[PDB]
Structure formats: C-alpha cells, structure tokens
Design a protein around this ligand. Sequence first.
Ligand SMILES: Cc1cc2nc3c(=O)[nH]c(=O)nc-3n(C[C@H](O)[C@H](O)[C@H](O)COP(=O)(O)OP(=O)(O)OC[C@H]3O[C@@H](n4cnc5c(N)ncnc54)[C@H](O)[C@@H]3O)c2cc1C
Ligand SMILES: Cc1cc2nc3c(=O)[nH]c(=O)nc-3n(C[C@H](O)[C@H](O)[C@H](O)COP(=O)(O)OP(=O)(O)OC[C@H]3O[C@@H](n4cnc5c(N)ncnc54)[C@H](O)[C@@H]3O)c2cc1C
Ligand SMILES: NC(=O)c1ccc[n+]([C@@H]2O[C@H](COP(=O)([O-])OP(=O)(O)OC[C@H]3O[C@@H](n4cnc5c(N)ncnc54)[C@H](OP(=O)(O)O)[C@@H]3O)[C@@H](O)[C@H]2O)c1
Ligand SMILES: NC(=O)c1ccc[n+]([C@@H]2O[C@H](COP(=O)([O-])OP(=O)(O)OC[C@H]3O[C@@H](n4cnc5c(N)ncnc54)[C@H](OP(=O)(O)O)[C@@H]3O)[C@@H](O)[C@H]2O)c1
Ligand SMILES: [Ca+2]
Ligand SMILES: [Ca+2]
Ligand SMILES: [Mg+2]
Lengths: 246, 247
Amino acid sequence: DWVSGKVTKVEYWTDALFSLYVRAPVHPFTAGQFTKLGLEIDGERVQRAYSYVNAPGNPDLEFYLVTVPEGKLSPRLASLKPGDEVLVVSEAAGFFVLEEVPDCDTLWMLATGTALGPYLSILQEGKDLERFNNLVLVHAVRYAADLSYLPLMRELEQRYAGKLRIQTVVSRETVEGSLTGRVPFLIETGALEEAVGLPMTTDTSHVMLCGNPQMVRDTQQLLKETRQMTKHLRRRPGHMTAEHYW
Amino acid sequence: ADWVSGKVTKVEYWTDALFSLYVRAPVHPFTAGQFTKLGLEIDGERVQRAYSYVNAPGNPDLEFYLVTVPEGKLSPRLASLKPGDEVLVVSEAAGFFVLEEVPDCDTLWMLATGTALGPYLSILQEGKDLERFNNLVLVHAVRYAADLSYLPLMRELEQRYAGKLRIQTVVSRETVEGSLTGRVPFLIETGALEEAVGLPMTTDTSHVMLCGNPQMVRDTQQLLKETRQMTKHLRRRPGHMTAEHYW
Ligand SMILES: Cc1cc2nc3c(=O)[nH]c(=O)nc-3n(C[C@H](O)[C@H](O)[C@H](O)COP(=O)(O)OP(=O)(O)OC[C@H]3O[C@@H](n4cnc5c(N)ncnc54)[C@H](O)[C@@H]3O)c2cc1C
Ligand SMILES: Cc1cc2nc3c(=O)[nH]c(=O)nc-3n(C[C@H](O)[C@H](O)[C@H](O)COP(=O)(O)OP(=O)(O)OC[C@H]3O[C@@H](n4cnc5c(N)ncnc54)[C@H](O)[C@@H]3O)c2cc1C
Ligand SMILES: NC(=O)c1ccc[n+]([C@@H]2O[C@H](COP(=O)([O-])OP(=O)(O)OC[C@H]3O[C@@H](n4cnc5c(N)ncnc54)[C@H](OP(=O)(O)O)[C@@H]3O)[C@@H](O)[C@H]2O)c1
Ligand SMILES: NC(=O)c1ccc[n+]([C@@H]2O[C@H](COP(=O)([O-])OP(=O)(O)OC[C@H]3O[C@@H](n4cnc5c(N)ncnc54)[C@H](OP(=O)(O)O)[C@@H]3O)[C@@H](O)[C@H]2O)c1
Ligand SMILES: [Ca+2]
Ligand SMILES: [Ca+2]
Ligand SMILES: [Mg+2]
C-alpha cells in the first residue's frame, strides 16, 4: 500500500550525492530493509527501491541517493524540496538483515557508493550484534569527497568501542587514511585484511555485499575462486550475502 | 602482450557520445568476434582497455565502435584522437566470442547492447563458416533511435544474406517505427521479439550470444534459464548461451 510522504529536507553532500529525509506513515521495518519511493512523472507513476539509512523507529526516514544524470526518477527526487509530496510503500521488503546472517567470528559489510544505507541502519540500531565478535564496515567510493557518511561512521566506530572496524576505499585518487583501488584487488593482495587487521576466510567470516552489481559479481567471483566461499541462500547457507542496486 | 604502435586514420562521430575509431597497425590476423586492447600513455600509466574489432579480419582499417564514458579514463581520450595520432595496440587478439566456439543450432541469435555490436559485425561482414546455421538473427538494443549507428551496414548485410539474416533493432527510451520498444528480457518474455523476427528462442532451436551491458547479459541469462530452461555455455560443458560482458 502506497502512502503519502512529506519531504522534510534534501541535503546535498556533493553535486551528485544527496540524502532525502521524509515523514510518512510506514510500518515498522527491520534494519537493512528497503522500501519504494514514487513520483508522478508526465502522468505516470514511477517507482524505485531505496534502502532505509535510519534505524527502525527513527521517524525521520532517510535515503542516501546519487543523481543518475539520464535516469527517470533519481533526478526528480533530487529536485524535491521541503514540503513536497513523495509516495512511500508502507511495508518494507528485503532479506539483507541481521537475522538472515549465519553465525561467524567476523561480519564484513562491503558497500559501494550510496549502498551504505542498510549497514548504517543496522549499526545505528545497534541490536543483535552480540553473537559477532568483530564487525567491519568498508565504504568504497570514487573520490574521498564521496564519503558522505564518514562522520557517522567515525561516531559509530567510537560507540562500538573496538568491536566495529571501519575502512574507507577510494578508487580514483590516493588519500591518507584510505585504501586505493577496487575491493577485489584489495582482498586478493591482502591489503584490505592487513589494513583492517582481520582475515576474510570461510573459517572466520560472513561477507555482505551491497551496491554496484559489477562489484558484487566480481567480489563473489574472487572470493569463490581464491577463498572457496559460496553464495548464501536461506535454504542453502553460504558465506556471501548480496544485494544488487541495479 | 606485444604492443605495437598504431596510427589513427580517422575518428568519426555518429552522435555527441558515439564514435568509431579507425586505426592502421601491424596486428596479427584475428578471428572475427575477437578483441584487442588499445592503450594511451596518460595519467601516469599506460591506460589500456579491451575493444572489439568491428572490421572483418583482413580489412586493414581496424575499426572500433566506442561510447564516450563521461568520467571514463580512456574512452574520452580515445574520443579526442585525430588523424595521425599514435595509439598503442596489442598485436595478438584474444577472446572466445567467435563462431568456432558456437554449438550447432538451427538459429544463432546475436544480441548486443550499445557499442557491443562489433563482434557480430566482424563475424557477419566476414560472412564465412555460417553455413551450418539455418537462420541468423541480429538484435541491436539502444536507448534512442539516433544511437543505431551501424543501421546502414545492418541493412546492407540483411540484403546480402538474402533472407538468412534477420535484423531487429530495439530502442528502450522512445517509440520509433521500425524498432521494438523496451528491454530485451521483457521482449523475450512477452514473445514480442520472436513474433517480430518470426523464429522461436528455445533450447530445441537456438543458441544465444549476448554481448555488452553486463546487467542485460545477466538478466537475459536469468530469464532464459528460468523460463526457457537454458544454461550457460562452456566449451567443456556445452550450453545454450554464450556471453561477453563489456564491464
Ligand atoms: C533494493 C534496492 C535498494 C536500492 N537502494 C538505493 C539507495 O539507497 N540509494 C540509491 O541511490 N539507489 C538505490 N537503489 C537504486 C535505485 O532503485 C535506482 O535504480 C536509482 O535511484 C536510479 O533510478 P533512476 O530511475 O534515476 O534510473 P534508472 O533509469 O531506473 O536506472 C539506470 C541506471 O542508474 C544507475 N544507478 C542506479 N542506482 C545507482 C546507484 N545507487 N549508484 C549508482 N548508479 C546507480 C545504473 O547505471 C542503472 O543502470 C536501490 C535499488 C534496489 C533494487
Ligand atoms: C572484451 C571487451 C570488449 C569491449 N569492447 C568494447 C567496444 O567495442 N567498445 C566500447 O566502447 N567499449 C568496449 N568495451 C569496454 C571498454 O573496454 C571500456 O571499459 C570502456 O571504453 C570505458 O573505459 P574508460 O577508461 O573510459 O572507463 P572506466 O573509467 O575504466 O570504466 C567505468 C565505467 O564505464 C562504463 N562503460 C564501460 N564500457 C562501456 C560501454 N561499452 N558502454 C557503456 N558504458 C560502458 C561502465 O559504467 C564502467 O563501470 C569492451 C570491454 C571488454 C572487456
Ligand atoms: N564523480 C564522482 O565522484 C561521482 C560520485 C557519485 C556519483 N557520480 C555519478 O554517478 C555515477 C557513479 O556513481 P557512484 O560513483 O556513486 O557509484 P559507482 O560507479 O558504482 O562507483 C562506486 C565504486 O565502485 C567501484 N566499482 C565499480 N565497478 C567495480 C567492479 N567491477 N569491481 C569493484 N569495484 C567496482 C568504483 O571503482 P571505479 O572508480 O574503479 O569505477 C567505485 O569505487 C556516474 O554516473 C557519475 O557521473 C559521480
Ligand atoms: N543520449 C543518450 O541516450 C546516450 C546514448 C549513448 C550513450 N550515452 C551515454 O553513455 C552511457 C550509456 O551508454 P549506452 O546507451 O551505449 O549503453 P547502456 O546504458 O548499456 O544501454 C544500452 C541498452 O541496454 C539496455 N539495458 C540496460 N540495462 C539493462 C538490463 N538490466 N536488462 C536489459 N537491458 C538493459 C538499456 O535499456 P534502458 O534504456 O532501459 O537502460 C539500453 O537499451 C551513459 O553515460 C550515457 O549518458 C548517452
Ligand atoms: Ca529527528
Ligand atoms: Ca547504467
Ligand atoms: Mg559504471
């Protein structure tokens, strides 16, 4: 069921990255889930999926978006202003949630670009992570200026008091404090595990992968070929849980 | 890889973003459907990317159909080459997206998005070793009708194959006469593509080649597996679909 949402704020982080804040009578959701946003464009209802950034129970629904220049809906969401109406599906969907994650010593959460949101909702909620000894959050972007949620990421790192390790990855420039390259290369060379201080192996880890579908594909391929890791299904458990954004 | 120096003979733009790059270079003979790598020494590296030959093997005008990727590293630099510029070229082609790897079938379907039409154009311009296929289907899927850069070549090929080759163009963001509207998996699932071409896409009749946009390749393979019971092809474990992803 669609419901009418009210835009409270659009905040731009760069010329292309922005966060959209909404009030809408949605149902409770599980951290990691997504809903759909909708607008009427040229007489047609256009809808896309967007992950909740906010923890469940935060009434300020938050979405981390990138403007796709030739896209249908994202440039229109990008022009929303406080007070504008946006349609929101009241029932969330998705299985990219903690309750579906197998037990493991280390939960790796890998995200590209604007796909960070499910992890932020999970980590801001802060519940049901006791059974994991280690948490690792990796945000991979083109440029350091694209690390829009680095302040929250550092606050979360502080609050988890050493359980959560954060690592930023910047692929198109070299910046102090970040690894340079793409995630598959960084896994294969040992760079990511050296920087984080933890191994990513079948004996220790479960790996969640969110965002760029070619990154998800290539990382799963590499983990399968070199780490003997398998894709996870609820009915057929494995080491790798993925959510593709397109 | 043995790099050789190539000479740009021409860059020809078809739209603001689509162009063909023409090169002379001492490359080895290649098999139609294969690709080489082009390189420029820029940005403190030898930036190199794979590009499919559009030309038939034996055509000395090496031809590459490219799209300018807005924030891309190499494609905007290739797009600003001029006659007489040097471009580096790997002399030995690579790739298995070639006829000798295609299982026997009644109908060979060749589906391409965007600038991934090149391997099929090289195969179909060469025109050899297609006797074992009864029917050939060439599908070019693009966003806008203006993006059908090789439509005149496709029409001449359609004429020269005297009916053996069926061509269909697909345009996803507008409705234009002569083209189907939408995305290839949707056109397959509704029967519209097959109705337009007049041939079925089934495991009994077809092998399907998929070239270009990796999501389209992924989604088309998924649809065909789920609804036509097709499998991915490996030389050692034959199946019904052969893919070449462009990223
Ligand atoms: C479960 C799910 C959750 C999603 N969550 C988010 C989210 O939190 N934030 C978000 O920005 N998008 C998210 N997406 C993607 C989103 O649904 C849209 O596809 C995106 O907003 C583009 O829509 P569009 O109509 O503008 O472009 P379309 O014309 O529908 O899409 C065309 C192209 O947009 C590009 N694209 C789409 N999404 C992204 C992206 N995230 N980053 C970079 N390029 C992209 C791809 O190149 C794609 O081929 C999610 C998708 C799914 C399925
Ligand atoms: C076997 C093979 C054959 C290829 N043949 C061709 C060809 O004939 N013509 C061609 O234009 N490209 C072709 N490609 C893609 C090509 O190698 C490059 O990736 C492309 O030119 C962009 O390079 P870049 O340095 O500009 O971009 P990068 O910054 O290195 O790439 C980033 C992004 O560019 C986009 N992109 C890459 N290729 C394409 C494409 N073809 N269409 C749309 N978006 C794209 C994707 O979004 C990709 O993530 C081929 C790739 C392979 C593996
Ligand atoms: N200029 C910018 O910084 C910027 C920022 C946001 C959005 N945009 C616009 O929006 C689009 C880009 O969105 P985005 O940058 O947020 O997302 P993106 O293109 O998915 O890039 C996110 C990250 O994923 C990496 N990646 C891509 N393919 C990969 C693969 N196969 N394996 C591993 N890693 C891979 C990229 O590395 P690579 O860098 O090597 O691709 C990058 O670090 C473009 O249309 C662009 O115009 C631009
Ligand atoms: N003016 C233009 O329209 C134009 C044309 C060429 C190049 N460009 C630029 O170059 C890039 C686009 O290049 P391109 O148009 O050559 O290639 P592309 O984005 O790969 O699109 C080629 C075709 O693939 C289809 N497709 C995409 N994802 C699919 C999927 N999951 N399943 C099935 N089909 C799918 C597209 O349909 P959809 O339309 O539904 O995505 C389109 O018909 C952008 O940066 C763009 O700005 C612009
Ligand atoms: Ca608040
Ligand atoms: Ca795209
Ligand atoms: Mg890309």
